[PDB]
Short mmCIF file of N, CA, C and O in Angstrom, two decimals:
data_model
loop_
_atom_site.label_atom_id
_atom_site.label_comp_id
_atom_site.label_asym_id
_atom_site.label_seq_id
_atom_site.Cartn_x
_atom_site.Cartn_y
_atom_site.Cartn_z
N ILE A 10 17.48 -3.89 -4.27
CA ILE A 10 16.50 -4.70 -5.09
C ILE A 10 16.03 -3.83 -6.22
O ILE A 10 15.81 -2.64 -6.03
N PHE A 11 15.91 -4.40 -7.41
CA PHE A 11 15.39 -3.69 -8.56
C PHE A 11 13.85 -3.83 -8.61
O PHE A 11 13.32 -4.89 -8.90
N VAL A 12 13.14 -2.75 -8.33
CA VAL A 12 11.70 -2.82 -8.11
C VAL A 12 10.97 -3.13 -9.40
O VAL A 12 11.35 -2.64 -10.47
N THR A 13 10.03 -4.06 -9.35
CA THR A 13 9.18 -4.40 -10.49
C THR A 13 7.75 -4.53 -9.95
O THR A 13 7.55 -4.55 -8.74
N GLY A 14 6.80 -4.56 -10.86
CA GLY A 14 5.45 -4.99 -10.60
C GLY A 14 4.51 -3.83 -10.36
O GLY A 14 4.90 -2.66 -10.49
N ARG A 15 3.30 -4.17 -9.92
CA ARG A 15 2.18 -3.24 -9.79
C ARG A 15 1.39 -3.55 -8.54
O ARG A 15 1.40 -4.70 -8.03
N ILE A 16 0.70 -2.52 -8.07
CA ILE A 16 -0.27 -2.70 -7.01
C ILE A 16 -1.69 -2.27 -7.41
O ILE A 16 -1.88 -1.16 -7.92
N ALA A 17 -2.67 -3.13 -7.13
CA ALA A 17 -4.10 -2.81 -7.36
C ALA A 17 -4.87 -2.50 -6.08
O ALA A 17 -4.71 -3.20 -5.08
N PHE A 18 -5.76 -1.49 -6.09
CA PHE A 18 -6.48 -1.14 -4.87
C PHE A 18 -7.69 -0.27 -5.24
O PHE A 18 -7.77 0.26 -6.36
N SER A 19 -8.61 -0.09 -4.30
CA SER A 19 -9.72 0.82 -4.52
C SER A 19 -9.78 1.78 -3.34
O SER A 19 -9.26 1.46 -2.23
N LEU A 20 -10.35 2.95 -3.61
CA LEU A 20 -10.44 4.02 -2.64
C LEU A 20 -11.87 4.50 -2.61
O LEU A 20 -12.47 4.73 -3.67
N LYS A 21 -12.41 4.65 -1.41
CA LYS A 21 -13.70 5.28 -1.22
C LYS A 21 -13.61 6.19 -0.02
O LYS A 21 -12.83 5.95 0.92
N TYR A 22 -14.39 7.26 -0.05
CA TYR A 22 -14.60 8.09 1.12
C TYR A 22 -16.05 7.93 1.58
O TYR A 22 -16.96 8.34 0.89
N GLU A 23 -16.24 7.27 2.73
CA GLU A 23 -17.56 7.20 3.35
C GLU A 23 -17.81 8.43 4.24
O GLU A 23 -17.05 8.69 5.19
N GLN A 24 -18.84 9.21 3.93
CA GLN A 24 -19.40 10.15 4.94
C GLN A 24 -20.09 9.40 6.06
O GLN A 24 -20.00 9.81 7.20
N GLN A 25 -20.77 8.30 5.74
CA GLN A 25 -21.53 7.62 6.79
C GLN A 25 -20.60 7.29 7.96
O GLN A 25 -21.04 6.88 9.03
N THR A 26 -19.29 7.46 7.74
CA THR A 26 -18.31 7.14 8.77
C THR A 26 -17.14 8.13 8.78
O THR A 26 -16.23 7.98 9.59
N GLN A 27 -17.19 9.15 7.92
CA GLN A 27 -16.10 10.17 7.76
C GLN A 27 -14.68 9.58 7.54
O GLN A 27 -13.70 10.12 8.05
N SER A 28 -14.57 8.51 6.75
CA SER A 28 -13.28 7.83 6.61
C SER A 28 -12.93 7.38 5.19
O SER A 28 -13.79 6.89 4.45
N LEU A 29 -11.67 7.56 4.82
CA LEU A 29 -11.12 7.03 3.59
C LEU A 29 -10.95 5.53 3.76
O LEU A 29 -10.29 5.08 4.70
N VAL A 30 -11.58 4.77 2.87
CA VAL A 30 -11.48 3.33 2.89
C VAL A 30 -10.57 2.88 1.74
O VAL A 30 -10.91 3.01 0.55
N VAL A 31 -9.43 2.34 2.13
CA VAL A 31 -8.43 1.89 1.19
C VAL A 31 -8.49 0.37 1.14
O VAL A 31 -8.03 -0.31 2.04
N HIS A 32 -9.04 -0.17 0.07
CA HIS A 32 -9.03 -1.60 -0.04
C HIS A 32 -7.82 -2.09 -0.85
O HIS A 32 -7.74 -1.88 -2.06
N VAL A 33 -6.89 -2.77 -0.19
CA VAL A 33 -5.74 -3.33 -0.90
C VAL A 33 -6.10 -4.70 -1.48
O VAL A 33 -6.37 -5.65 -0.75
N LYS A 34 -6.05 -4.80 -2.79
CA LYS A 34 -6.40 -6.03 -3.45
C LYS A 34 -5.25 -6.99 -3.61
O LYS A 34 -5.36 -8.15 -3.22
N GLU A 35 -4.13 -6.55 -4.16
CA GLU A 35 -3.18 -7.54 -4.67
C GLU A 35 -1.97 -6.83 -5.28
O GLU A 35 -2.12 -5.71 -5.77
N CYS A 36 -0.79 -7.46 -5.21
CA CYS A 36 0.36 -7.00 -6.01
C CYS A 36 0.63 -8.07 -7.09
O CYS A 36 0.25 -9.25 -6.91
N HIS A 37 1.28 -7.64 -8.17
CA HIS A 37 1.63 -8.48 -9.27
C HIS A 37 3.11 -8.29 -9.63
O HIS A 37 3.56 -7.15 -9.78
N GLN A 38 3.85 -9.40 -9.77
CA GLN A 38 5.24 -9.40 -10.23
C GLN A 38 6.15 -8.54 -9.39
O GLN A 38 6.98 -7.75 -9.93
N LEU A 39 6.04 -8.70 -8.07
CA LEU A 39 7.00 -8.09 -7.15
C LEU A 39 8.37 -8.65 -7.45
O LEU A 39 8.47 -9.75 -7.98
N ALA A 40 9.43 -7.93 -7.07
CA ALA A 40 10.79 -8.48 -7.15
C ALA A 40 10.99 -9.58 -6.10
O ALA A 40 10.27 -9.64 -5.11
N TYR A 41 11.96 -10.45 -6.32
CA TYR A 41 12.36 -11.40 -5.28
C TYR A 41 13.29 -10.68 -4.31
O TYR A 41 14.31 -10.15 -4.72
N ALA A 42 12.94 -10.66 -3.02
CA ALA A 42 13.85 -10.15 -1.99
C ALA A 42 15.03 -11.14 -1.76
O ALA A 42 16.13 -10.73 -1.45
N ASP A 43 14.77 -12.43 -1.91
CA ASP A 43 15.80 -13.44 -1.81
C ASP A 43 15.86 -14.10 -3.16
O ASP A 43 15.14 -15.06 -3.41
N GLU A 44 16.69 -13.56 -4.04
CA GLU A 44 16.86 -14.10 -5.38
C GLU A 44 17.41 -15.55 -5.33
O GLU A 44 16.94 -16.43 -6.06
N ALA A 45 18.39 -15.81 -4.47
CA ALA A 45 18.87 -17.18 -4.34
C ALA A 45 17.64 -18.08 -4.44
O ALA A 45 17.45 -18.81 -5.44
N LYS A 46 16.81 -18.03 -3.40
CA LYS A 46 15.67 -18.93 -3.29
C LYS A 46 14.40 -18.47 -4.01
O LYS A 46 13.35 -19.09 -3.88
N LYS A 47 14.47 -17.37 -4.76
CA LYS A 47 13.29 -16.93 -5.48
C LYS A 47 12.14 -16.58 -4.56
O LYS A 47 11.02 -17.03 -4.77
N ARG A 48 12.39 -15.77 -3.55
CA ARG A 48 11.39 -15.65 -2.52
C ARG A 48 11.14 -14.22 -2.05
O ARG A 48 12.08 -13.46 -1.91
N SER A 49 9.87 -13.90 -1.83
CA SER A 49 9.45 -12.70 -1.08
C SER A 49 8.32 -13.04 -0.14
O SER A 49 7.55 -13.95 -0.41
N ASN A 50 8.25 -12.34 0.97
CA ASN A 50 7.18 -12.52 1.94
C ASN A 50 6.52 -11.17 2.13
O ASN A 50 6.83 -10.49 3.07
N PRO A 51 5.63 -10.75 1.21
CA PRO A 51 5.23 -9.32 1.15
C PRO A 51 4.07 -8.82 2.00
O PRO A 51 3.07 -9.49 2.17
N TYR A 52 4.19 -7.59 2.50
CA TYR A 52 3.05 -6.89 3.05
C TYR A 52 3.06 -5.48 2.51
O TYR A 52 4.09 -4.97 2.03
N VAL A 53 1.91 -4.88 2.52
CA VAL A 53 1.80 -3.53 2.05
C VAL A 53 1.63 -2.63 3.25
O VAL A 53 0.91 -2.97 4.18
N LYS A 54 2.27 -1.47 3.22
CA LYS A 54 1.99 -0.47 4.25
C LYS A 54 1.58 0.85 3.58
O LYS A 54 1.98 1.12 2.45
N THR A 55 0.70 1.62 4.23
CA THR A 55 0.23 2.91 3.70
C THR A 55 0.54 4.03 4.71
O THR A 55 0.53 3.80 5.93
N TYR A 56 0.85 5.22 4.18
CA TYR A 56 0.72 6.48 4.94
C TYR A 56 -0.08 7.50 4.14
O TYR A 56 0.00 7.54 2.90
N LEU A 57 -0.82 8.33 4.86
CA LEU A 57 -1.33 9.58 4.32
C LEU A 57 -0.27 10.65 4.60
O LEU A 57 -0.30 11.32 5.63
N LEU A 58 0.68 10.79 3.69
CA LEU A 58 1.78 11.70 3.88
C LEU A 58 1.14 13.05 4.22
O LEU A 58 0.12 13.39 3.62
N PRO A 59 1.77 13.85 5.11
CA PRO A 59 3.13 13.65 5.62
C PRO A 59 3.14 13.05 7.00
O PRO A 59 4.15 13.10 7.68
N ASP A 60 2.02 12.48 7.41
CA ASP A 60 2.01 11.79 8.65
C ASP A 60 2.64 10.38 8.46
O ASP A 60 1.98 9.41 8.00
N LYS A 61 3.92 10.29 8.82
CA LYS A 61 4.65 9.04 8.77
C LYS A 61 4.86 8.49 10.16
O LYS A 61 5.69 7.61 10.37
N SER A 62 4.10 9.02 11.10
CA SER A 62 4.09 8.49 12.45
C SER A 62 3.56 7.07 12.41
O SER A 62 2.93 6.67 11.44
N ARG A 63 3.82 6.33 13.49
CA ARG A 63 3.37 4.95 13.59
C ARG A 63 1.86 4.83 13.47
O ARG A 63 1.36 4.15 12.58
N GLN A 64 1.08 5.47 14.33
CA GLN A 64 -0.36 5.29 14.13
C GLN A 64 -0.91 6.14 12.99
O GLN A 64 -2.09 6.27 12.83
N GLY A 65 -0.03 6.73 12.19
CA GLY A 65 -0.42 7.25 10.87
C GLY A 65 -0.27 6.12 9.85
O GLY A 65 -0.54 6.28 8.66
N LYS A 66 0.13 4.95 10.35
CA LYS A 66 0.54 3.85 9.50
C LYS A 66 -0.57 2.84 9.44
O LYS A 66 -1.26 2.61 10.45
N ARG A 67 -0.78 2.25 8.26
CA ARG A 67 -1.66 1.06 8.18
C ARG A 67 -0.87 -0.03 7.45
O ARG A 67 0.11 0.26 6.75
N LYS A 68 -1.27 -1.29 7.61
CA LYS A 68 -0.54 -2.35 6.92
C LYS A 68 -1.45 -3.55 6.76
O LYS A 68 -2.35 -3.76 7.57
N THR A 69 -1.23 -4.29 5.69
CA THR A 69 -1.86 -5.59 5.48
C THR A 69 -1.07 -6.66 6.28
O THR A 69 0.00 -6.39 6.80
N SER A 70 -1.60 -7.87 6.34
CA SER A 70 -0.87 -9.00 6.87
C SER A 70 0.19 -9.33 5.85
O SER A 70 0.25 -8.70 4.77
N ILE A 71 0.99 -10.35 6.17
CA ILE A 71 2.11 -10.76 5.34
C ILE A 71 1.82 -12.05 4.61
O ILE A 71 1.33 -13.00 5.23
N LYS A 72 2.09 -12.12 3.30
CA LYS A 72 1.96 -13.41 2.61
C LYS A 72 3.32 -14.07 2.52
O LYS A 72 4.35 -13.40 2.42
N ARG A 73 3.34 -15.38 2.55
CA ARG A 73 4.60 -16.08 2.66
C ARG A 73 4.95 -16.58 1.28
O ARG A 73 4.11 -17.07 0.56
N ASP A 74 6.18 -16.37 0.88
CA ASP A 74 6.66 -16.95 -0.35
C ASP A 74 5.78 -16.71 -1.58
O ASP A 74 5.28 -17.65 -2.20
N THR A 75 5.60 -15.44 -1.96
CA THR A 75 4.90 -15.15 -3.22
C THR A 75 5.25 -13.75 -3.70
O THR A 75 5.48 -12.86 -2.87
N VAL A 76 5.31 -13.57 -5.03
CA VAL A 76 5.49 -12.25 -5.65
C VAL A 76 4.19 -11.71 -6.29
O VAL A 76 4.17 -10.62 -6.87
N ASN A 77 3.11 -12.49 -6.13
CA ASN A 77 1.73 -12.10 -6.51
C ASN A 77 0.75 -12.20 -5.35
O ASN A 77 -0.28 -12.88 -5.43
N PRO A 78 1.05 -11.51 -4.24
CA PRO A 78 0.14 -11.59 -3.10
C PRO A 78 -1.28 -11.07 -3.36
O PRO A 78 -1.50 -10.02 -3.99
N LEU A 79 -2.25 -11.80 -2.82
CA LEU A 79 -3.61 -11.44 -2.95
C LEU A 79 -4.04 -11.16 -1.51
O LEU A 79 -4.00 -12.06 -0.69
N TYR A 80 -4.41 -9.92 -1.20
CA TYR A 80 -4.72 -9.51 0.16
C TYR A 80 -6.24 -9.38 0.41
O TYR A 80 -6.78 -9.93 1.39
N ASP A 81 -6.90 -8.59 -0.45
CA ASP A 81 -8.25 -8.10 -0.17
C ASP A 81 -8.49 -7.68 1.26
O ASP A 81 -9.37 -8.22 1.95
N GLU A 82 -7.71 -6.69 1.71
CA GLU A 82 -7.77 -6.22 3.08
C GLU A 82 -8.01 -4.75 3.05
O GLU A 82 -7.37 -4.05 2.28
N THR A 83 -8.92 -4.28 3.89
CA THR A 83 -9.26 -2.85 3.96
C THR A 83 -8.51 -2.14 5.04
O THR A 83 -8.46 -2.60 6.17
N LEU A 84 -7.91 -1.01 4.69
CA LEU A 84 -7.19 -0.19 5.62
C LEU A 84 -8.03 1.05 5.67
O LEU A 84 -8.60 1.45 4.65
N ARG A 85 -8.13 1.69 6.83
CA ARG A 85 -9.14 2.74 6.96
C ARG A 85 -8.59 3.92 7.72
O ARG A 85 -7.98 3.74 8.75
N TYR A 86 -8.74 5.11 7.16
CA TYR A 86 -8.28 6.33 7.79
C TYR A 86 -9.52 7.16 8.11
O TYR A 86 -10.17 7.74 7.22
N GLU A 87 -9.86 7.18 9.39
CA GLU A 87 -10.84 8.11 9.89
C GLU A 87 -10.28 9.51 9.70
O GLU A 87 -9.23 9.81 10.25
N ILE A 88 -10.97 10.37 8.97
CA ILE A 88 -10.45 11.70 8.67
C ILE A 88 -11.49 12.58 7.95
O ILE A 88 -11.81 12.33 6.77
N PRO A 89 -12.03 13.60 8.64
CA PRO A 89 -12.86 14.54 7.89
C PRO A 89 -12.22 14.78 6.52
O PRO A 89 -11.06 14.48 6.33
N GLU A 90 -12.98 15.35 5.58
CA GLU A 90 -12.61 15.39 4.17
C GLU A 90 -11.73 16.58 3.82
O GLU A 90 -11.01 16.55 2.82
N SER A 91 -11.83 17.63 4.63
CA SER A 91 -11.13 18.90 4.41
C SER A 91 -9.63 18.71 4.49
O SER A 91 -8.86 19.35 3.80
N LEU A 92 -9.22 17.84 5.39
CA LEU A 92 -7.81 17.58 5.60
C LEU A 92 -7.22 16.57 4.59
O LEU A 92 -6.02 16.42 4.48
N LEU A 93 -8.09 15.92 3.82
CA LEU A 93 -7.65 14.90 2.87
C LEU A 93 -7.05 15.58 1.66
O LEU A 93 -6.13 15.06 1.02
N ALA A 94 -7.56 16.77 1.35
CA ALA A 94 -7.20 17.44 0.11
C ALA A 94 -5.75 17.91 0.11
O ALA A 94 -5.20 18.32 -0.93
N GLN A 95 -5.14 17.85 1.30
CA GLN A 95 -3.74 18.19 1.51
C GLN A 95 -2.79 16.98 1.36
O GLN A 95 -1.59 17.13 1.13
N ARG A 96 -3.32 15.77 1.50
CA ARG A 96 -2.48 14.60 1.64
C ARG A 96 -2.16 13.83 0.35
O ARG A 96 -2.78 14.02 -0.68
N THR A 97 -1.14 12.97 0.45
CA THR A 97 -0.81 12.01 -0.56
C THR A 97 -0.85 10.63 0.12
O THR A 97 -0.20 10.42 1.14
N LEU A 98 -1.64 9.71 -0.43
CA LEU A 98 -1.67 8.32 0.07
C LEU A 98 -0.49 7.53 -0.55
O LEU A 98 -0.36 7.43 -1.77
N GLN A 99 0.38 7.00 0.29
CA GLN A 99 1.53 6.31 -0.24
C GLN A 99 1.50 4.84 0.18
O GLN A 99 1.44 4.53 1.37
N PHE A 100 1.49 3.95 -0.80
CA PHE A 100 1.67 2.51 -0.57
C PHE A 100 3.14 2.17 -0.66
O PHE A 100 3.82 2.63 -1.56
N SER A 101 3.64 1.33 0.23
CA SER A 101 4.96 0.77 0.01
C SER A 101 4.93 -0.71 0.39
O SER A 101 4.23 -1.10 1.31
N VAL A 102 5.67 -1.51 -0.35
CA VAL A 102 5.60 -2.95 -0.28
C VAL A 102 6.94 -3.43 0.33
O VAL A 102 8.04 -2.89 -0.01
N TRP A 103 6.85 -4.41 1.23
CA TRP A 103 8.02 -4.78 2.05
C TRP A 103 8.14 -6.29 2.14
O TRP A 103 7.14 -6.99 2.31
N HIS A 104 9.37 -6.80 2.06
CA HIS A 104 9.62 -8.19 2.30
C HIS A 104 9.89 -8.40 3.81
O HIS A 104 10.80 -7.79 4.37
N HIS A 105 9.09 -9.22 4.46
CA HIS A 105 9.38 -9.50 5.86
C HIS A 105 10.32 -10.68 5.89
O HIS A 105 9.92 -11.78 5.56
N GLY A 106 11.57 -10.44 6.27
CA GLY A 106 12.60 -11.45 6.07
C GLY A 106 13.26 -12.00 7.32
O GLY A 106 12.71 -11.91 8.44
N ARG A 107 14.45 -12.59 7.12
CA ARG A 107 15.24 -13.24 8.17
C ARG A 107 15.37 -12.30 9.39
O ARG A 107 15.51 -11.09 9.26
N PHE A 108 15.28 -12.86 10.58
CA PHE A 108 15.37 -12.06 11.80
C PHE A 108 14.39 -10.91 11.81
O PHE A 108 14.55 -9.97 12.58
N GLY A 109 13.40 -10.93 10.94
CA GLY A 109 12.44 -9.83 10.94
C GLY A 109 12.94 -8.59 10.23
O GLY A 109 12.32 -7.54 10.30
N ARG A 110 14.07 -8.66 9.53
CA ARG A 110 14.48 -7.51 8.73
C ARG A 110 13.43 -7.24 7.64
O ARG A 110 12.98 -8.16 6.97
N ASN A 111 13.05 -5.99 7.44
CA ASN A 111 12.11 -5.66 6.37
C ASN A 111 12.80 -4.99 5.20
O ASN A 111 13.46 -3.98 5.40
N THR A 112 12.64 -5.55 4.00
CA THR A 112 13.28 -5.02 2.80
C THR A 112 12.28 -4.38 1.83
O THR A 112 11.27 -4.96 1.48
N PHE A 113 12.60 -3.19 1.37
CA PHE A 113 11.73 -2.39 0.51
C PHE A 113 11.59 -3.07 -0.81
O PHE A 113 12.57 -3.49 -1.37
N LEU A 114 10.36 -3.20 -1.30
CA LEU A 114 10.05 -3.84 -2.59
C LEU A 114 9.39 -2.87 -3.57
O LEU A 114 9.02 -3.25 -4.66
N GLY A 115 9.22 -1.62 -3.20
CA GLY A 115 8.56 -0.68 -4.10
C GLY A 115 7.49 0.19 -3.47
O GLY A 115 6.92 -0.10 -2.41
N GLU A 116 7.15 1.25 -4.20
CA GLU A 116 6.34 2.30 -3.67
C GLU A 116 5.46 2.88 -4.76
O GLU A 116 5.86 2.94 -5.92
N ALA A 117 4.28 3.37 -4.39
CA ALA A 117 3.47 4.18 -5.31
C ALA A 117 2.60 5.16 -4.51
O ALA A 117 2.34 4.95 -3.31
N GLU A 118 2.18 6.22 -5.17
CA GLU A 118 1.41 7.28 -4.49
C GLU A 118 0.22 7.75 -5.30
O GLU A 118 0.22 7.68 -6.53
N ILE A 119 -0.75 8.31 -4.60
CA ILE A 119 -1.80 9.03 -5.27
C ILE A 119 -2.17 10.27 -4.42
O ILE A 119 -2.41 10.17 -3.22
N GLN A 120 -2.16 11.43 -5.06
CA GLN A 120 -2.51 12.71 -4.40
C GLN A 120 -4.01 12.85 -4.19
O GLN A 120 -4.79 12.63 -5.11
N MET A 121 -4.43 13.19 -2.98
CA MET A 121 -5.84 13.14 -2.67
C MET A 121 -6.55 14.33 -3.30
O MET A 121 -7.71 14.21 -3.70
N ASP A 122 -5.87 15.46 -3.40
CA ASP A 122 -6.50 16.69 -3.92
C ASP A 122 -7.17 16.46 -5.27
O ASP A 122 -8.37 16.69 -5.41
N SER A 123 -6.41 15.96 -6.26
CA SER A 123 -7.04 15.58 -7.53
C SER A 123 -7.99 14.36 -7.43
O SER A 123 -9.08 14.39 -8.03
N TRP A 124 -7.62 13.33 -6.67
CA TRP A 124 -8.53 12.20 -6.46
C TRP A 124 -9.91 12.63 -5.91
O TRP A 124 -10.94 12.12 -6.34
N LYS A 125 -9.92 13.56 -4.95
CA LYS A 125 -11.15 13.97 -4.30
C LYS A 125 -12.28 14.41 -5.26
O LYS A 125 -13.44 14.34 -4.91
N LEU A 126 -11.94 14.88 -6.46
CA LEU A 126 -12.99 15.36 -7.34
C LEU A 126 -13.96 14.24 -7.76
O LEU A 126 -15.17 14.27 -7.42
N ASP A 127 -13.45 13.27 -8.52
CA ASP A 127 -14.36 12.23 -9.01
C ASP A 127 -14.30 10.96 -8.18
O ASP A 127 -15.12 10.05 -8.35
N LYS A 128 -13.31 10.92 -7.28
CA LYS A 128 -13.13 9.76 -6.41
C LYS A 128 -13.25 8.47 -7.19
O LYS A 128 -14.03 7.60 -6.82
N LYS A 129 -12.50 8.35 -8.28
CA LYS A 129 -12.47 7.08 -9.02
C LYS A 129 -12.22 5.93 -8.05
O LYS A 129 -11.36 6.05 -7.17
N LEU A 130 -12.96 4.83 -8.21
CA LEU A 130 -12.92 3.71 -7.26
C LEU A 130 -11.66 2.84 -7.40
O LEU A 130 -10.93 2.62 -6.44
N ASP A 131 -11.39 2.36 -8.62
CA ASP A 131 -10.37 1.36 -8.87
C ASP A 131 -9.07 1.92 -9.51
O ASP A 131 -9.13 2.74 -10.42
N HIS A 132 -7.93 1.40 -9.04
CA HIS A 132 -6.59 1.85 -9.43
C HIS A 132 -5.61 0.70 -9.53
O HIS A 132 -5.73 -0.31 -8.84
N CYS A 133 -4.63 0.88 -10.41
CA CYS A 133 -3.58 -0.08 -10.57
C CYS A 133 -2.34 0.71 -10.93
O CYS A 133 -2.29 1.31 -12.03
N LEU A 134 -1.37 0.77 -10.02
CA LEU A 134 -0.20 1.62 -10.20
C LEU A 134 1.10 0.79 -10.29
O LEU A 134 1.27 -0.21 -9.58
N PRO A 135 2.05 1.21 -11.15
CA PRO A 135 3.36 0.55 -11.17
C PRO A 135 4.14 0.98 -9.92
O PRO A 135 3.98 2.10 -9.44
N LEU A 136 4.92 0.08 -9.34
CA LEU A 136 5.76 0.45 -8.23
C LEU A 136 7.09 1.15 -8.67
O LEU A 136 7.68 0.80 -9.68
N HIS A 137 7.54 2.11 -7.88
CA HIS A 137 8.80 2.82 -8.10
C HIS A 137 9.85 2.39 -7.08
O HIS A 137 9.50 2.05 -5.95
N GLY A 138 11.12 2.47 -7.47
CA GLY A 138 12.24 2.26 -6.55
C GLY A 138 12.46 3.53 -5.76
O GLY A 138 11.70 4.48 -5.89
N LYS A 139 13.48 3.56 -4.90
CA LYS A 139 13.80 4.79 -4.19
C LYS A 139 15.25 5.16 -4.45
O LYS A 139 15.61 5.49 -5.61
#
């Protein structure tokens, strides 16, 4: 698939709970996983690299038949702050398809070390292929 589009999200670090709060807002102009029928069924998944273990994983629900999914779903990583400065938060977007096959629709990252300084709230990143 030729990756297109963007992902919007916000990031906060709550001390009141010692956790990175990743709010996934929406993707725009995802590629069609099924070009025949013009269709994608997208969900977003996150890792705080390099933990690519399963419970290092977070994910939104799946939207059916859209390339502009609107999620507004919060994913949350409980994690003291010292260990965050080492990580990269990686979003990847997936088509949940026939027989449950999942097809890659694009990826984007943000390094926490530089983010940690001003902790800018809102972001919108273009997706990359692999």
